Protein backbone atom coordinates (compact mmCIF):
# COMPACT_ATOMS: atom_id res chain seq x y z
CA UNK A 1 0.00 0.00 0.00
CA UNK A 2 1.29 3.44 -1.04
CA UNK A 3 0.12 6.58 0.78
CA UNK A 4 0.39 10.13 -0.59
CA UNK A 5 -0.06 13.10 1.76
CA UNK A 6 -0.07 16.57 0.20
CA UNK A 7 0.39 20.00 1.73
CA UNK A 8 -1.40 22.07 -0.89
CA UNK A 9 0.03 25.34 -2.18
CA UNK A 10 0.75 27.15 -5.42
CA UNK A 11 4.19 28.63 -4.78
CA UNK A 12 5.06 26.16 -1.98
CA UNK A 13 3.38 22.77 -2.34
CA UNK A 14 4.80 19.67 -0.71
CA UNK A 15 4.08 15.96 -0.68
CA UNK A 16 5.14 13.04 1.50
CA UNK A 17 5.03 9.46 0.22
CA UNK A 18 4.81 6.55 2.65
CA UNK A 19 4.78 2.79 2.13
CA UNK A 20 2.30 0.93 4.33
CA UNK A 21 3.06 -2.75 4.96
CA UNK A 22 -0.07 -4.19 6.58
CA UNK A 23 1.79 -7.49 7.10
CA UNK A 24 4.52 -6.07 9.36
CA UNK A 25 2.36 -3.19 10.71
CA UNK A 26 5.32 -0.90 9.97
CA UNK A 27 5.72 2.36 8.05
CA UNK A 28 8.64 3.55 5.91
CA UNK A 29 9.22 7.04 4.53
CA UNK A 30 10.14 6.95 0.84
CA UNK A 31 10.42 10.56 -0.30
CA UNK A 32 9.33 14.07 0.64
CA UNK A 33 9.80 16.72 -2.04
CA UNK A 34 9.05 20.41 -2.51
CA UNK A 35 7.06 21.04 -5.69
CA UNK A 36 6.08 23.96 -7.92
CA UNK A 37 2.50 24.45 -9.13
CA UNK A 38 2.71 27.97 -10.60
CA UNK A 39 2.87 26.84 -14.26
CA UNK A 40 -0.15 24.71 -15.24
CA UNK A 41 -1.03 23.57 -11.75
CA UNK A 42 -3.40 20.96 -13.20
CA UNK A 43 -0.68 19.10 -15.10
CA UNK A 44 1.78 19.62 -12.24
CA UNK A 45 -0.60 18.07 -9.70
CA UNK A 46 -1.51 15.17 -12.01
CA UNK A 47 2.20 14.48 -12.56
CA UNK A 48 3.20 14.73 -8.90
CA UNK A 49 0.36 12.51 -7.71
CA UNK A 50 0.50 9.80 -10.39
CA UNK A 51 4.32 9.68 -10.17
CA UNK A 52 4.36 7.03 -7.44
CA UNK A 53 0.92 5.51 -8.25
CA UNK A 54 -0.63 5.91 -4.78
CA UNK A 55 -3.35 3.73 -3.32
CA UNK A 56 -4.66 6.55 -1.09
CA UNK A 57 -4.21 10.33 -1.27
CA UNK A 58 -4.41 12.54 1.82
CA UNK A 59 -5.23 16.21 1.26
CA UNK A 60 -5.11 19.02 3.81
CA UNK A 61 -8.45 20.69 4.52
CA UNK A 62 -8.19 24.40 3.76
CA UNK A 63 -11.98 31.06 -0.57
CA UNK A 64 -8.38 29.88 -0.95
CA UNK A 65 -6.98 28.95 -4.39
CA UNK A 66 -6.22 25.49 -2.98
CA UNK A 67 -9.71 24.01 -2.69
CA UNK A 68 -9.63 24.03 -6.48
CA UNK A 69 -6.64 21.69 -6.22
CA UNK A 70 -8.51 19.55 -3.67
CA UNK A 71 -11.48 19.05 -5.97
CA UNK A 72 -9.29 18.71 -9.08
CA UNK A 73 -7.58 15.78 -7.35
CA UNK A 74 -10.95 14.39 -6.26
CA UNK A 75 -12.22 14.41 -9.85
CA UNK A 76 -8.90 13.13 -11.18
CA UNK A 77 -8.95 10.03 -8.95
CA UNK A 78 -12.72 9.44 -9.01
CA UNK A 79 -12.99 6.57 -11.51
CA UNK A 80 -9.60 5.20 -10.39
CA UNK A 81 -8.75 2.71 -7.63
CA UNK A 82 -7.16 5.41 -5.44
CA UNK A 83 -9.07 6.75 -2.44
CA UNK A 84 -8.84 10.50 -1.82
CA UNK A 85 -9.32 11.52 1.82
CA UNK A 86 -9.29 15.13 3.03
CA UNK A 87 -8.05 15.54 6.60
CA UNK A 88 -7.94 18.44 9.03
CA UNK A 89 -4.67 20.34 9.53
CA UNK A 90 -2.49 18.30 11.88
CA UNK A 91 -3.63 25.94 18.95
CA UNK A 92 -2.32 29.41 19.67
CA UNK A 93 -2.01 31.74 16.72
CA UNK A 94 -1.89 30.45 13.15
CA UNK A 95 1.79 31.51 13.04
CA UNK A 96 2.75 29.17 15.93
CA UNK A 97 1.37 26.17 14.00
CA UNK A 98 4.28 26.09 11.54
CA UNK A 99 6.85 26.20 14.36
CA UNK A 100 5.14 23.39 16.26
CA UNK A 101 4.97 21.38 13.04
CA UNK A 102 8.67 21.89 12.31
CA UNK A 103 9.60 20.83 15.84
CA UNK A 104 7.44 17.69 15.73
CA UNK A 105 8.91 16.95 12.29
CA UNK A 106 12.60 17.37 13.14
CA UNK A 107 12.04 15.23 16.22
CA UNK A 108 9.81 12.48 14.77
CA UNK A 109 11.16 11.85 11.26
CA UNK A 110 14.30 10.03 12.46
CA UNK A 111 12.22 6.94 13.31
CA UNK A 112 11.07 6.47 9.71
CA UNK A 113 13.70 7.51 7.15
CA UNK A 114 17.26 7.13 8.56
CA UNK A 115 17.95 9.89 6.00
CA UNK A 116 17.44 12.88 8.30
CA UNK A 117 20.64 14.82 7.61
CA UNK A 118 20.22 14.92 3.83
CA UNK A 119 16.55 15.91 4.11
CA UNK A 120 17.52 18.80 6.39
CA UNK A 121 20.47 19.84 4.20
CA UNK A 122 18.49 19.80 0.94
CA UNK A 123 15.43 21.68 2.23
CA UNK A 124 16.11 24.55 4.63
CA UNK A 125 12.51 25.78 4.91
CA UNK A 126 10.64 23.00 6.70
CA UNK A 127 7.08 24.40 6.84
CA UNK A 128 5.32 22.49 4.07
CA UNK A 129 7.61 19.46 4.45
CA UNK A 130 6.66 19.10 8.12
CA UNK A 131 3.01 19.73 7.23
CA UNK A 132 2.85 16.91 4.68
CA UNK A 133 4.79 14.51 6.93
CA UNK A 134 2.52 15.15 9.92
CA UNK A 135 -0.57 14.91 7.71
CA UNK A 136 0.45 11.46 6.48
CA UNK A 137 1.18 10.40 10.05
CA UNK A 138 -2.17 11.69 11.32
CA UNK A 139 -3.95 9.69 8.63
CA UNK A 140 -2.03 6.48 9.31
CA UNK A 141 -2.66 6.75 13.06
CA UNK A 142 -6.32 5.98 12.32
CA UNK A 143 -5.21 2.79 10.52
CA UNK A 144 -3.28 1.38 13.50
CA UNK B 1 -19.54 16.56 -32.01
CA UNK B 2 -21.49 16.64 -28.73
CA UNK B 3 -21.49 19.76 -26.54
CA UNK B 4 -22.47 19.80 -22.85
CA UNK B 5 -23.24 23.12 -21.16
CA UNK B 6 -23.88 22.99 -17.42
CA UNK B 7 -25.60 25.51 -15.18
CA UNK B 8 -23.96 24.62 -11.87
CA UNK B 9 -25.90 24.26 -8.62
CA UNK B 10 -26.31 21.79 -5.79
CA UNK B 11 -30.05 21.91 -5.17
CA UNK B 12 -30.83 23.27 -8.68
CA UNK B 13 -28.37 22.08 -11.33
CA UNK B 14 -29.20 22.06 -15.02
CA UNK B 15 -27.56 20.86 -18.22
CA UNK B 16 -28.11 21.44 -21.93
CA UNK B 17 -26.85 19.00 -24.56
CA UNK B 18 -26.29 20.15 -28.14
CA UNK B 19 -25.11 18.34 -31.26
CA UNK B 20 -22.65 20.37 -33.34
CA UNK B 21 -22.27 19.55 -37.04
CA UNK B 22 -19.30 21.61 -38.25
CA UNK B 23 -20.02 20.43 -41.80
CA UNK B 24 -23.52 21.93 -42.06
CA UNK B 25 -22.79 24.83 -39.66
CA UNK B 26 -26.03 23.89 -37.87
CA UNK B 27 -26.95 23.21 -34.25
CA UNK B 28 -29.54 20.79 -32.83
CA UNK B 29 -30.81 20.64 -29.26
CA UNK B 30 -30.90 17.08 -27.92
CA UNK B 31 -32.06 17.36 -24.31
CA UNK B 32 -32.23 19.84 -21.45
CA UNK B 33 -32.97 18.39 -18.02
CA UNK B 34 -32.99 19.68 -14.45
CA UNK B 35 -30.87 17.49 -12.18
CA UNK B 36 -30.38 16.86 -8.46
CA UNK B 37 -26.92 16.95 -6.87
CA UNK B 38 -27.89 16.89 -3.18
CA UNK B 39 -27.09 13.17 -2.67
CA UNK B 40 -23.42 12.44 -3.45
CA UNK B 41 -22.87 15.34 -5.81
CA UNK B 42 -19.68 13.68 -7.08
CA UNK B 43 -21.52 10.59 -8.35
CA UNK B 44 -24.43 12.71 -9.59
CA UNK B 45 -22.15 15.00 -11.63
CA UNK B 46 -20.15 12.08 -13.04
CA UNK B 47 -23.41 10.38 -14.06
CA UNK B 48 -25.01 13.46 -15.61
CA UNK B 49 -21.90 14.42 -17.57
CA UNK B 50 -20.89 10.98 -18.86
CA UNK B 51 -24.56 10.27 -19.71
CA UNK B 52 -24.34 11.57 -23.28
CA UNK B 53 -20.53 11.19 -23.70
CA UNK B 54 -19.71 14.81 -24.59
CA UNK B 55 -16.76 15.98 -26.64
CA UNK B 56 -16.62 19.37 -24.89
CA UNK B 57 -18.00 20.54 -21.54
CA UNK B 58 -18.99 24.15 -20.88
CA UNK B 59 -18.96 25.25 -17.24
CA UNK B 60 -20.23 28.48 -15.72
CA UNK B 61 -17.61 30.73 -14.12
CA UNK B 62 -18.03 30.95 -10.35
CA UNK B 63 -16.16 32.86 -7.68
CA UNK B 64 -13.96 31.03 -5.20
CA UNK B 65 -16.32 32.08 -2.39
CA UNK B 66 -19.18 30.18 -4.05
CA UNK B 67 -19.82 26.52 -3.12
CA UNK B 68 -19.96 25.65 -6.84
CA UNK B 69 -16.30 26.03 -7.83
CA UNK B 70 -15.87 22.66 -6.14
CA UNK B 71 -18.11 21.21 -8.86
CA UNK B 72 -16.20 23.16 -11.53
CA UNK B 73 -12.83 21.75 -10.48
CA UNK B 74 -14.23 18.28 -9.79
CA UNK B 75 -15.36 18.20 -13.42
CA UNK B 76 -12.00 19.57 -14.57
CA UNK B 77 -10.16 16.79 -12.74
CA UNK B 78 -12.75 14.23 -13.84
CA UNK B 79 -12.14 14.90 -17.55
CA UNK B 80 -8.41 15.64 -17.30
CA UNK B 81 -6.14 13.94 -19.88
CA UNK B 82 -9.34 12.52 -21.43
CA UNK B 83 -10.73 13.28 -24.90
CA UNK B 84 -13.26 15.81 -23.53
CA UNK B 85 -12.33 19.50 -23.41
CA UNK B 86 -13.50 21.42 -20.33
CA UNK B 87 -14.06 25.14 -20.94
CA UNK B 88 -15.19 27.63 -18.30
CA UNK B 89 -17.31 30.45 -19.73
CA UNK B 90 -18.55 33.76 -18.35
CA UNK B 91 -22.20 34.13 -17.29
CA UNK B 92 -24.22 34.93 -20.40
CA UNK B 93 -26.66 43.48 -14.78
CA UNK B 94 -29.36 44.52 -12.33
CA UNK B 95 -30.76 42.07 -9.83
CA UNK B 96 -30.55 38.30 -10.15
CA UNK B 97 -34.27 38.27 -10.88
CA UNK B 98 -33.87 40.68 -13.80
CA UNK B 99 -31.00 38.51 -15.05
CA UNK B 100 -33.21 35.42 -14.81
CA UNK B 101 -36.10 37.23 -16.51
CA UNK B 102 -33.96 38.29 -19.48
CA UNK B 103 -32.55 34.75 -19.67
CA UNK B 104 -36.03 33.18 -19.57
CA UNK B 105 -37.29 35.52 -22.29
CA UNK B 106 -34.34 34.79 -24.59
CA UNK B 107 -34.78 31.07 -23.84
CA UNK B 108 -38.55 30.75 -24.30
CA UNK B 109 -38.25 32.66 -27.57
CA UNK B 110 -35.02 31.17 -28.96
CA UNK B 111 -35.32 27.45 -28.14
CA UNK B 112 -38.05 26.92 -30.76
CA UNK B 113 -35.46 27.43 -33.53
CA UNK B 114 -33.49 24.37 -32.37
CA UNK B 115 -35.79 21.76 -30.80
CA UNK B 116 -39.33 22.00 -32.29
CA UNK B 117 -40.32 20.60 -28.86
CA UNK B 118 -41.27 23.85 -27.11
CA UNK B 119 -44.69 22.98 -25.67
CA UNK B 120 -43.63 19.85 -23.77
CA UNK B 121 -40.49 21.56 -22.45
CA UNK B 122 -42.66 24.36 -21.07
CA UNK B 123 -45.24 21.94 -19.67
CA UNK B 124 -42.72 19.70 -17.91
CA UNK B 125 -40.56 22.36 -16.21
CA UNK B 126 -42.28 25.38 -14.69
CA UNK B 127 -39.25 27.19 -13.23
CA UNK B 128 -37.06 28.12 -16.20
CA UNK B 129 -34.15 30.00 -14.55
CA UNK B 130 -31.32 27.45 -14.60
CA UNK B 131 -32.68 25.82 -17.77
CA UNK B 132 -32.46 29.13 -19.64
CA UNK B 133 -29.03 29.72 -18.11
CA UNK B 134 -27.60 26.43 -19.39
CA UNK B 135 -29.17 26.87 -22.83
CA UNK B 136 -27.79 30.40 -23.21
CA UNK B 137 -24.39 29.24 -21.93
CA UNK B 138 -24.19 26.57 -24.62
CA UNK B 139 -25.24 29.12 -27.23
CA UNK B 140 -22.66 31.66 -26.02
CA UNK B 141 -19.95 29.03 -26.36
CA UNK B 142 -21.01 27.96 -29.85
CA UNK B 143 -21.14 31.58 -31.04
CA UNK B 144 -17.34 31.60 -30.71
CA UNK B 145 -17.24 28.53 -32.99
Numbering used by the authors:
A (entry chain B): 1 to 62, 65 to 92, 95 to 148
B (entry chain A): 1 to 92, 95 to 147
Quote the study that presented this structure, word for word.
The DNA resolvases orthologous to the A22 protein of vaccinia virus play an essential role in poxviral replication, by resolving HJ structures formed at the inverted repeat junctions in a concatemer of linear genomic DNAs. The fowlpox virus resolvase (Fpr) forms a stable dimer as other homologous resolvases14–17 and was found to bind to various structural motifs on the HJ DNA, revealing flexibility of the Fpr dimer in binding to a wide range of DNA structures. The 150-residue Fpr protein has the characteristic architecture of enzymes from the retrovirus integrase/RNase H superfamily, comprising a single layer of β-sheet sandwiched between α-helices.
Four additional surface conformational entropy reduction mutations, K65A, K102A, K103A, and Q104A, helped improve crystal quality and the structure was determined and refined to 3.1 Å. A HJ DNA substrate, HJ 13/13 with four 13 bp arms, was required for crystallization of Fpr and present in the washed crystals. However, no DNA molecules were observed in the electron density map and the structure obtained was that of Fpr in the APO (DNA-free) form. Divalent cadmium ion used in the crystallization reservoir solution at 10 mM concentration, was identified in the active center pocket, coordinated by the acidic active site residues, D7, E60, D132, and N135 (D135 in the wild-type). In the Fpr dimer, αB helices from each protomer form the major dimer interface. The dimer interface is mainly formed by the hydrophobic interactions, including F64, Y73, F74, F78, and Y80. A notable difference is that the Cpr crystal structure does not have clear electron density for the helix αD, whereas the Fpr structure shows a well ordered αD helix with clear electron density. In contrast, the active sites and the surrounding DNA-binding surfaces of the two Fpr monomers are not well separated due to the shorter αB and the loop preceding the αB helix, and they form a larger flat pocket.
